[PDB]
Amino acid sequence: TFRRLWPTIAPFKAGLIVAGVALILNAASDTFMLSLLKPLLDDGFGKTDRSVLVWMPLVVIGLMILRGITSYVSSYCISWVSGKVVMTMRRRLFGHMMGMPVSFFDKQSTGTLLSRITYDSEQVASSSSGALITVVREGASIIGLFIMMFYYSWQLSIILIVLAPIVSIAIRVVSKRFRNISKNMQNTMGQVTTSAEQMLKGHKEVLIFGGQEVETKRFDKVSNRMRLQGMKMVSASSISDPIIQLIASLALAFVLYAASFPSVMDSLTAGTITVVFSSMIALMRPLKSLTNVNAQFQRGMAACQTLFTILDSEQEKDEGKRVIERATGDVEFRNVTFTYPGRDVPALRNINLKIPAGKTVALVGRSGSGKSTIASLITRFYDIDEGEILMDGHDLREYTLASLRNQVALVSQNVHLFNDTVANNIAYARTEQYSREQIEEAARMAYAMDFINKMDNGLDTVIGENGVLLSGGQRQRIAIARALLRDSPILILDEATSALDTESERAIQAALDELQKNRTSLVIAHRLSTIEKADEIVVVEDGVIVERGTHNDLLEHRGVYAQ
Template identity: 50%
Template sequence: MQESATNTYKRLLGYVKDFKSAAIVAVIGMLGYSAMDATFVWLMQPFIDDGLTDRNSTVLTWAPYVVIALVIGRGTFNFLSSYCLAYVGSQVVRSLRQDLFTHMLNLPVSFHDNHSNGELISKITFDTEQVQQAITKALLVLVREGAYVVFLLVVMFSASWKLSLIFLVITPIVAVIVSVVSKRFRKISKNIQNAMGDVTRCSEQMLSGHKVIHGFNGQQQETERFARVNNINRLQRVKMDATKALSVSVIQILAASSMAVILVLISMPGMIDSITSGTFVTLISSMMLMLRPLKQLSNVNSELQRGIAAAQSIFAVLDTEIEKDTGTVVIEKAKGIIEVNNLNFTYPSVTDPVLKGLNLKIAAGEKIALVGRSGSGKSTLSNLLPRYYDIADREAITLDGEPLDTYTLKSLRQQFAIVSQQVVLFNDTIANNIMYGLETPLSESDLIEVAKKAHVWEFVKDLPEGLQTTIGEDGVMLSGGQRQRIAIARAIVKDAPILILDEATSALDTESEKLIQNALESLMRDKTAIIIAHRLSTIEQADCIYVMDKGQIIEQGTHAQLLEKDGTYAALAKMQQGEAV
């Protein structure tokens, strides 16, 4: 359930607590700035009545010094408020952005399955910027201009409380307008955030899939798709600006009407004789000067509501429960005994089960293979072992005789080295990609040794910067086979007792595959290995092969035994032999 706007802003201001000293100075600066401006208006009455009307030269002599003092004070308070508020705002947004990033990093995989990267990136970048506007610009205007309005009212009442009462008649009307407009601003702001998420998502898809787009001549299709979401974003912003302009105009008309009534009353014979020139100028000046802060206060409402809507969106993510780490046992090095007992699993976002009553046992140091058509549940099992998804029956999967959730997440995942078909590399050097996650970096000689084992050294040695070569975003500078070898080198460095190879050689040519197979055989020595493969030639030496279909094991045995059965596995083997010929 989404928090109210008031609670959201209170929670947002909770981030200010760590920087309250600077925030207090900022508020003092804002109040001082407004007080200087109001004091200048207040002094107009004695300047005119005492200085000009009564010809008091002392008042007129001091007037320039007072004005200079007010200007200096105004500038000092302005610097204090602007600098301290900017400091607090940037610190709050930094903290908020850091919390959001860290929280997203620890959210379960199922959360990321249901949210696009573009949407989440938009929250970290765009939404947090909107929050900064609510913290800095909106707060600056609310406090400074709000205080200015109050100070001007005090000046007006000190000049003539009877006439000033008329100006207060518009206050409840303005309050109603602000309340109605605030709800609309917040609604439009949410629509703008969603639209920006779509813009980010379309942009991300275009940038990451530009080769496919060019290959299939999809430029027009992507251009039209982006034009649609871009136009939706434009329409929402036009609605925001139209609402803002209408509210400002209505409030200014009300203020001007009050001023007109006061001018009519002043022009009456009974009133004109009882009011001095200084009082008249002070009243009119206060009312005229009040139009500007009233306009700014009306305008800032849109910024404030936009920030609150963005904060609600951010807090909704921050309130999402992170991965449950209920394990208490820290396992240093697992034996590698895995048992799966009557495992049933359904992904959170779908209704049909992916695994149904799955049973298998893997002994320590055993090499097993999972084969079967796409969608049979092979990769799902590899996702369940490191607990990327939780299972309903905690006893359904055990490691060394204990349910997976017995172990802490960190120590459990330390037991698995996963090399998947989709290699993820970071925009960093080859060396740092190989050593990713290591607490203690390898020495240069050890790193080269690992690179040689994974056959990375063959293409790295000729590069000008060698292992220190930056490979670009997601390894764009490398071929598919080279990226796969780096992933294998990363697994060698981790040296986990359990190895999961999910189509690990799929991106390699025949020559590279043979080289990598030798490296993998060395890597799998004395380790429990789970090999997921479509290419049966890569699993012929496995201790046991499990053939899966629709989430169940339909055949199991060695390569020779399964060929003798002349079942599904044998049919797959014959099909691949035919393709090879």
């Protein structure tokens, strides 16, 4: 439980303990000020004297600068735990996310990963700090006030300490009822959310038929059902606080009825009774929070448990011990039967495809099956279920992923561009081993000149997100340069659109001639240039091996592009 989050807290005890002391001093400052009451009313206004009257204002100002400076110190030095553990958990999650398989990213979890990184890791230490600020402050206030009563009037404290548990458990039971009701109606609010969003999703279809009068009549019945439970939210929550205050007020009436009604119980003067009868009311926040704390501690810890399910999810299983500077040998597939995680119909059964060195393979991309998975299986995005994949004799899994993944460079129109500059995203993890001259030849040979060659600014310009919103016509070319900065024995080409380009198609033929005159390439095809200019055209797709041949043998039998 908390024992696994404790090591993260461990190097910040120097902040946590100081926050705890700054808050117990806050509670003591909110109790000595009440202790000032008895002299003020007893030795002052009752028994006429001015020493207490003159000394009380400066004492109050002193105690309030103590209240303020210690509250500020607690708030600052708890954010050195709630702001330096949020950072560490976010960074540990992020480091445990970039080395986890893209299979997790493959719609097993949607874009709520950003929420789990930011909002959840904020809430963990915003609610587990709210269950330490609360615990230390309020459990200091409780003990301080109970110490206050004993020295001043233990005749009322001996009644209060036995009145405590009923008022303490009443709030707990009513709060449990409130939380159970909220958990019950979670389904109702989820249902109205689904009913509201699905019409906005299917606006087209609902508009297609006669009219939306029936649709809004249907919406009325869910609006009413949400109204009737929005009523019940307040009818269940605003019954808790009045009932708690009424029980606490019965206790208040009990202690007040414990007056000098017994003539023996005449030890209380006005100052003696005012402090106790006031701490009675000061006891509302702490005894409430001491029982509402467990509703937030175990909830922040539930969020941390979700983050720990994320974190304990295994990284990519990296066990290869091989590195290759230039994959000279042939790359080929051998009876690679593969199923995506979460799919039953195999998108790729046994395939014996081979990619000879210095030659290209073009897969026609209209079918939409066995297109991206053949690309992915070379990069160890999704590991092969049953099969063998060989580069330079040896199997694919013998290499470490850090060594392998540089041996393949994917190029696509739908290409992710980094927040950094154009001189950095071109050479991500390659600023160290490649210099500005290399970036310049990469830009020159890749024909990125229409956007970035002419200016004397040269290399570094803002091009990414929150930049100039680079167009596709040069996203393709900067991806081409990203691949064409060498150390790319194998390339994967998408050509998803194959649409109007201002000689960017000529640029990618230049890329073809430049970086597979001696290197390999596996391509998915959507253009007549891909159909015509290709050493070996393989239209193997639909999870089946059907054709294999050059331009003369584009067809096994009459079919697609078999002219």
